[PDB]
């Protein structure tokens, strides 16, 4: 996209697509950074991406990849019930 448009970008809050600008926040309940969303579905920030956003165990980021996942153990990194479906998002700096 054009340079002007790249500057005038707005924050996606649902139906996240590769290239979207997103707001990333810590979700203490789920022990992870998440994308701010008005959707009921959880979009976790992939562990691989925390350093890219100057995070260490809010920020703005750009979605690079997304993966649809299901929790297969009741005790899991995401503190969700067994069988919960959610996304993991890789993001880069804006």
């Amino acid at each position: 996209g054009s340079e002007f448009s790249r500057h005038s970008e707005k924050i996606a809050i649902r139906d996240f697509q590769v290239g979207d600008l997103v707001l990333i926040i810590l979700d203490e309940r789920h022990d992870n950074y998440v994308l701010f969303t008005v959707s009921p579905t959880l979009y976790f920030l992939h562990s691989e991406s925390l350093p890219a956003l100057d995070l260490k165990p809010w920020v703005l980021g750009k979605v690079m990849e997304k993966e649809y996942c299901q929790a297969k153990k009741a005790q899991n990194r995401f503190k969700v019930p067994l069988g919960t479906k959610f996304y993991r998002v890789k993001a880069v700096s804006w």
């Binding site: 649809y68 929790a71 297969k72 005790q75 899991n76 479906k85």
Partner: peptide, 9 residues
């Protein structure tokens, strides 16, 4: 490390 989850496609 991706043992508590499975990617669904």
């Amino acid at each position: 490390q991706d043992d508590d989850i499975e990617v669904i496609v």
